Design an enzyme around this catalytic site. Sequence first.
Site, PDB file in Angstrom:
ATOM      1  N   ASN B 222       0.793  -1.215   0.000  1.00 49.43           N
ATOM      2  CA  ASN B 222       0.000   0.000   0.000  1.00 49.43           C
ATOM      3  C   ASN B 222       0.822   1.259   0.000  1.00 49.43           C
ATOM      4  O   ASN B 222       0.412   2.244  -0.616  1.00 49.43           O
ATOM      5  CB  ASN B 222      -0.974  -0.006   1.152  1.00 49.43           C
ATOM      6  N   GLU B 248      -9.477  16.017 -17.666  1.00 48.37           N
ATOM      7  CA  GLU B 248      -8.247  15.966 -18.439  1.00 48.37           C
ATOM      8  C   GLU B 248      -7.639  14.582 -18.460  1.00 48.37           C
ATOM      9  O   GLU B 248      -6.920  14.277 -19.396  1.00 48.37           O
ATOM     10  CB  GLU B 248      -7.229  16.984 -17.912  1.00 48.37           C
TER      11      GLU B 248
END
Lengths: 131, 434, 434, 430, 429
Positions: B222, B248
């Site tokens: 993680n 975007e």
Amino acid sequence: ADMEVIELNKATSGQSWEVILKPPSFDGVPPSLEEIQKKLEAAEERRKYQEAELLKHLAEKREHEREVIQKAIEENNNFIKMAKEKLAQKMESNKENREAHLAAMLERLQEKDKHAEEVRKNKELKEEASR
Amino acid sequence: MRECISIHVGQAGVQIGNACWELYCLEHGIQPDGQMPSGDDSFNTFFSETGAGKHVPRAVFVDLEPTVIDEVRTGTYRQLFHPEQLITGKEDAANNYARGHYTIGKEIIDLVLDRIRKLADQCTGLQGFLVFHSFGGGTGSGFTSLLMERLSVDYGKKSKLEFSIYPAPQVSTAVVEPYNSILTTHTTLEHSDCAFMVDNEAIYDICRRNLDIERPTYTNLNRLISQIVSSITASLRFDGALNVDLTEFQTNLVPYPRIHFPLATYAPVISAEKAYHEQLSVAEITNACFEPANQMVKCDPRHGKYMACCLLYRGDVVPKDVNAAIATIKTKRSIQFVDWCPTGFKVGINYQPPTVVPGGDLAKVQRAVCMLSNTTAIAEAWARLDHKFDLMYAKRAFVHWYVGEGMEEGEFSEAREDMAALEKDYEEVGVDSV
Amino acid sequence: MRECISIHVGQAGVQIGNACWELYCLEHGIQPDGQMPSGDDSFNTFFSETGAGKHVPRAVFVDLEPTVIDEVRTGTYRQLFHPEQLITGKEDAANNYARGHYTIGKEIIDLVLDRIRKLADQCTGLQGFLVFHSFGGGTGSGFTSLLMERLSVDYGKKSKLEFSIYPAPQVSTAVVEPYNSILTTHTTLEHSDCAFMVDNEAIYDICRRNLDIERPTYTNLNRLISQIVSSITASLRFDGALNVDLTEFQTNLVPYPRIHFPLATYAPVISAEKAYHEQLSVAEITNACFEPANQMVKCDPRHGKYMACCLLYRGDVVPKDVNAAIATIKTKRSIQFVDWCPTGFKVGINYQPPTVVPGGDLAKVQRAVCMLSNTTAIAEAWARLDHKFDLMYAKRAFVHWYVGEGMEEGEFSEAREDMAALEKDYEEVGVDSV
Amino acid sequence: MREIVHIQAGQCGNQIGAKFWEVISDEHGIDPTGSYHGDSDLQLERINVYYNEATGNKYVPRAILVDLEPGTMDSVRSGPFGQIFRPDNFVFGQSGAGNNWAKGHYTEGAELVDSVLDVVRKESESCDCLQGFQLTHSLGGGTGSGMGTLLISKIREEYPDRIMNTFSVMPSPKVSDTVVEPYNATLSVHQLVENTDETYCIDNEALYDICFRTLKLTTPTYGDLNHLVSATMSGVTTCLRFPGQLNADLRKLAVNMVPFPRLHFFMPGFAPLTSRGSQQALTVPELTQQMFDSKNMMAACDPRHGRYLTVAAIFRGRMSMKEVDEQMLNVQNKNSSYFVEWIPNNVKTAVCDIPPRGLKMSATFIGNSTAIQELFKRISEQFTAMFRRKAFLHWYTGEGMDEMEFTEAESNMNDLVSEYQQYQDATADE
Amino acid sequence: MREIVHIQAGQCGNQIGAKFWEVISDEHGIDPTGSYHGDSDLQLERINVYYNEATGNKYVPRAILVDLEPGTMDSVRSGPFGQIFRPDNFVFGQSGAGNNWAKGHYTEGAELVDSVLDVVRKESESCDCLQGFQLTHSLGGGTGSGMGTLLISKIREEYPDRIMNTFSVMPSPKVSDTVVEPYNATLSVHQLVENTDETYCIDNEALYDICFRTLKLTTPTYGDLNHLVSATMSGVTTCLRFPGQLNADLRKLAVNMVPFPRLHFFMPGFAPLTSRGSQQALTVPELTQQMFDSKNMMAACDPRHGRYLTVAAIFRGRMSMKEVDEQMLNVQNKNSSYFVEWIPNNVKTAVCDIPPRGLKMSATFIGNSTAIQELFKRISEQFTAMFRRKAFLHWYTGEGMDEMEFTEAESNMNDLVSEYQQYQDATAD
Ligand SMILES: Nc1nc2c(ncn2[C@@H]2O[C@H](COP(=O)(O)OP(=O)(O)OP(=O)(O)O)[C@@H](O)[C@H]2O)c(=O)[nH]1
Ligand SMILES: Nc1nc2c(ncn2[C@@H]2O[C@H](COP(=O)(O)OP(=O)(O)OP(=O)(O)O)[C@@H](O)[C@H]2O)c(=O)[nH]1
Ligand SMILES: C=C1COc2cc3c(cc21)-c1c(cc(OC)c(OC)c1OC)CC[C@@H]3NC(C)=O
Ligand SMILES: C=C1COc2cc3c(cc21)-c1c(cc(OC)c(OC)c1OC)CC[C@@H]3NC(C)=O
Ligand SMILES: Nc1nc2c(ncn2[C@@H]2O[C@H](COP(=O)(O)OP(=O)(O)O)[C@@H](O)[C@H]2O)c(=O)[nH]1
Ligand SMILES: Nc1nc2c(ncn2[C@@H]2O[C@H](COP(=O)(O)OP(=O)(O)O)[C@@H](O)[C@H]2O)c(=O)[nH]1
Ligand SMILES: [Mg+2]
Ligand SMILES: [Mg+2]
């Protein structure tokens, strides 16, 4: 050997641009809430049906369980009933037989009593003739 | 201002969320209590502010079982989140998509939508959502697809980006994870605008090979994933110039809507225990972007075609060196783009250097890069998953668990047919004409 | 609960009852006055308790003549029984089944049943009845079969177990005993769940050979019989290592309702006068169970098939030694089981050692065993009785005495045909399947 | 999914059940009074799964003790940990079942079943999130077999949403208490196939053979057999009881081990095979070798006679995770023909730091193998040998049962074996 | 089954009956006044069977004395123990029967029977559990045979549920009181076959032959014959009178000795054969040897000429019961051909510690042998010799009898013979 840099944007903590090595080889570039509620409700009803069918199957098991106990009671009761009637029949057949044996014994001894009266009668008919 | 709300679903989503928000706090100088002593107000896209100067993540954590979110509730960052944004049920989906989507999920969907609405009310210009979840878990797969469908109803225009954990047998997998992965992928496909898959096998191998960790933990995995997530979200949290808004991402990386799965590749990943390390140049870290050992998904882009390539640099990087690095790449390898796309790169440099978690395994570097490329090679990941799905489904192995929860067998074949169409879509892009 | 009511009918039943209850009192520490200085409480299955601490046998003694029960009424144990439990008539059945079942028996049946009902009222979980009687006596044969028939009416399928004395010429027999034996066996067959036959010749031979008694008396015979009866009822009167319930006895012994006559075999039976010779192991006493010298019925199980085998141990016996002893027996060829019986064994172990009557002929031992085996060989006992029946019946010798009492000649042939069917049933159970 | 309610029925059920509580209480640091006297916070982390917390921080097993005879439960109460159990959870009759399935299921057991359900209901109501039930019983007797399966069906009716897990002891002529064992066993597996989610098949034939052949005990006792059972039960439940890599759960186990609903009979295994007494240091390669060893199976089946649908391997003790992973991969490639290829990644491995008492390292195997059909075929053959002649049948018909119920139980068990054979012959040919 | 009511009818019946009571009274320690003077509690244990207990703990025989002539009953009253009998139990006529069966059965006996039945009824009513009746009488006379058989039929009618046992003295020309004895005997056995449960055949031919041949008394008297009868009667009833190894009972004896209702005529035997008042020591083997000895039989039949249907042997005196058992087994294996194989275990033995007066040891034999047909054949031959010529038939026809009644009685006794022969020839096949 030939590159093209196109300055896109520049900002306080960043800077961006595009670098083209070679151009392309083409002219042109190339549910609702009711529906979702219907799907979720259709799944819930399928699951509900499956559980109902399982509980119905288990209800059938419970029914068979009380039919087993009932059958055990019914078989025991029919064993008591047959034994009661067979015994009553046996004791009745025996009473009839013993009554008949004793009745026949009474009759054969009663015949002897009748014969003894006949013998005494026969003595009278022989007597009173001699002397 | 352009706000982004993060939604962390299931154990994988929650635990990855913990690592991301820990890193964001370190990057922005926010303490675990929410206090921030003080590019400028850009961090407000991810953090709201309280009347007492507390900075609270625009995030919601959801899990159908309480144990994972309970560690957040009693952990180091317990003060960072309002209790209302940590949502838990009593029993989990038991690694069953149908249990998480149809039976248990229906119990808390309205509650989670109400908390997400509460966060949206605090936004003056909500961009959209970032959804973190596993493909394999019953909650990560089932609940996420249910949530994505409802979010598309309540927020029609908003972009929805995913960070999905792709399953690996080496990293605590269940046998039914291929079923849950295909089922969630099918239902979420039309509702997601861009999805960043993270193959657990890729992250596991990078931890072993580059960080010298013999048996990586979820914390090791993680922390590395969060470095990549941070690289992609840095332009939303600072005054960047490439990927300034989440619309975007779709514009720059996903020219074809269904083919919205970019491949992320990050460099450098150096062990903090590796001494005298001479800092890597822009050319060295850029070249590492094309090495498969540094990819987030195990696949081979060499035998595929690119449709977009975005280079996100962080730290001590100057444009002249980036352009020199890109020029030499052209001459060394045959990186082939699809007929309709130009062979090129959209490059952005965020001056903020890579932040490392103190006491972590990653070494602090002066410069790093994350490449986001839309390659047809990522369809290899679908092919592997679909094959495992087919092996089991041919025998109907385990499908009674799903049918028991009200899902029909028709949904399995529908999901598989959509995956077959998706693999065919990547094939159509991989060979073009007229 | 788990109560058992004992019913002793006729001279043999009463005199055996005396020896049994004398032994039970000594085993449980009950004095002849009913007082028991004081636990187990398992003894309550056979003894009820009075508010004044008196332990009274759950038993009824019945005889159509008073002399035998009168010795109990004036004997050592006169205080043990309530007068109402000791029932007598004025004239016996004169060795005639017909007088015991009809002529004389009918006069006292209702009184006996009323007294049995009174004992059943004291039971919270009545297991059934144990009926002791001779095959040869007019009362033992005729009255018992009338009682068994009436018990089936009043108690339905409630278990009824018999301890029957099989006739022997050496031990005070009458000429008509074979008639009374077949008549009672036919009549009682459908009403008895399990019957333990005790051949007087076998007991006579055991007393002569094992106890060195030149001319055994009824006291010598009955004390030995009581040791065997005690072994089979000890399982109900004590709590040992492995306890055998009354229902468990029959379930494991009786494969078919009619085939319910187990062969009892006891060991060790040794003289109180004998030289030292230290105690017989579990293996030695167990192996003695398969030696014909120790059997209660004269027959040859070596040329028969076993259907079940129950081993009832008492005293200094541990399960590990029993299992080792059974393992050796299982490897022996001289003991053939029927092919339809996977494992014929059932073991009971009671820690209370064998009790001996002071002044008796039996030596006190540390451990003893009584085996109850259902073998096809027991049918040899039926064959001997049936032959004696045939010799007399072919001439109709003595049958006028039975006909005089209301019986019919048809009942003789019906009883004999049932015995023929029974012998044929024992042949069929031993034949191999498919 | 937190609490599990344990039920032990009949002689065998209460004997192995008591052994189970003795073993896990020692592992969790609980003494016979219920007080914690351990030195690891890992022992209490998930103790709530099997224990209720009582006044004075006492730990009381969430266990319900059932029998139709008072004898066995008096011996449990007098046993080593007999005092730990909740007195109100002892539910016993006085009649006994006489090793008769019909008596336990239809007659004597039917009278006591409501009393037991009242205790189960009381325990279930005090659960924050009940996972399900765990039943220990034999299939050869009358109470554990007949009443145990009656309890299961009643529990399924009241808790259709919960998992039903059993540790079922199979009968063997090698260690037999009754001639009628094959009837009782067949009637019970007919119930288990329909009403259980997972059943661990603890075979007395296998336990005897392990004691006789491997441990070289010429005359094994139930105590020796039960030592193997308790060790297996401790291993099989390690994931549920301890904080590890695996977050545990009975439903997640069933979803991962049961590909077809009726095929839920597991073949447990254990390494090292130990006897009671002064023992000897096993290695990871040695532990993994025993996975396929028929000699280490608690069910009398040869795994190499079938294929594994699914396999769980739990290693206990301080060992190399890298080594376990490499040895497990080795076993799978060199035994590929004993795993179904159509269930990818069907062999899962878990590792727990806490080893069992007396062992530095151990491995417990849980297999869903098609070879388990050998166990059912053995019971079926024994059943037919008796049923062919209707031997002892009057004891069942006397309780109200019909011969038809025997034919149906036998037929369903024969269907169960044909189903295992179907998947044993299935290939990934497409 | 406790009390037995004894009846003695006619001259012979009262003479042997008185001897019976003298013998058993001495055995039970009862003196002629009725007081107990014995020293064994075994003498009183079962004294209730034959004696009633009276005021002053006296024992009174449950005996009824019957006769149509007062003569014999006056001699009984004056005899030894004559004063023990209940005076009210003496029922006697004054006419006499003149050795005429018809007179005893149909004429003067018919007038007196109700008076006797009244006394029988009174005795029976004082019984806790009456077993039955025991009659002593001759078959050759008129009162004992004629009235005795009338009494039995009348008793059977009133007490069908009780046992009728008789000690019947068979006539013989060697002893003789009249040429009509074969008529009286045939008419009586015709009654006994139908109305009795057990009859002990005490043959005067056998008693005379024992006295003449064995005891070497050239001229035997009735006293000498009666000594053999009393000894036999004492032996035959030992099992009823004394506490022994076996219970006792008249019905149990009948059920075990009588396989066919009509074949209930027993051949008694006794050892040792003792002289009327003389003293002189036999062993168990010697006692058992006499079981088969024809010379020791009280019926003039050779047991080796037939087969035993059933046999009871009672040994009296202090002896080894083991020796008795071994000697009895020896006799059975070496005489197997004289026992019917189709009645298993048909030889029973009893042993009583109390020996009879004057003997240290003795054995009494009770046999149901088919050889008894020799006794019936002898009476039948004598009957036919007279009946062919209708000799003395007017004695009976004068009382009202028909010649058809003679033909029927003869036919019934001939049937009885054929029946004994049938079972003598029957095999187990
Ligand atoms: N990278 C990573 N993967 C994780 C993490 N936690 C779980 N996974 C992976 O996610 C998959 C299992 O899904 P989970 O997230 O644990 O399940 P869930 O969403 O909570 O759903 P339930 O089945 O209802 O518990 C496996 O492939 C795991 O390796 C984590 O923190 N990091
Ligand atoms: N073992 C044994 N057998 C006995 C005993 N008493 C009698 N018998 C046998 O039982 C048979 C005779 O039956 P009994 O019991 O005496 O007769 P009953 O039941 O009183 O019947 P009645 O004929 O009416 O007296 C013979 O085989 C005897 O040997 C005894 O106490 N023990
Ligand atoms: C045989 C298979 C195929 O896939 C599986 C996945 C899993 C399990 C078994 C299998 C499994 C589970 C629970 C367990 O105890 C509570 C357990 O120990 C016995 C288990 O075996 C290790 C359920 C979840 C578990 N998942 C993980 C990541 O390990
Ligand atoms: C000839 C047989 C074949 O079976 C028999 C059985 C028994 C008797 C004779 C026979 C018998 C009986 C009564 C007696 O006096 C009252 C008596 O003494 C004359 C008897 O002979 C010894 C009847 C009962 C006796 N039962 C026993 C066990 O001994
Ligand atoms: N392994 C084991 N099997 C047992 C034990 N006790 C009994 N059994 C077996 O259980 C079966 C008999 O069932 P049991 O539980 O004793 O009877 P129940 O009380 O009626 O359920 C037979 O197969 C026995 O061999 C025990 O302690 N351990
Ligand atoms: N043994 C014996 N026979 C007797 C005695 N008195 C008479 N008899 C025989 O009895 C028969 C005559 O019958 P009897 O009793 O005198 O005549 P009743 O007075 O008419 O009964 C003849 O066969 C006599 O030999 C006696 O005291 N003893
Ligand atoms: Mg989870
Ligand atoms: Mg008797």
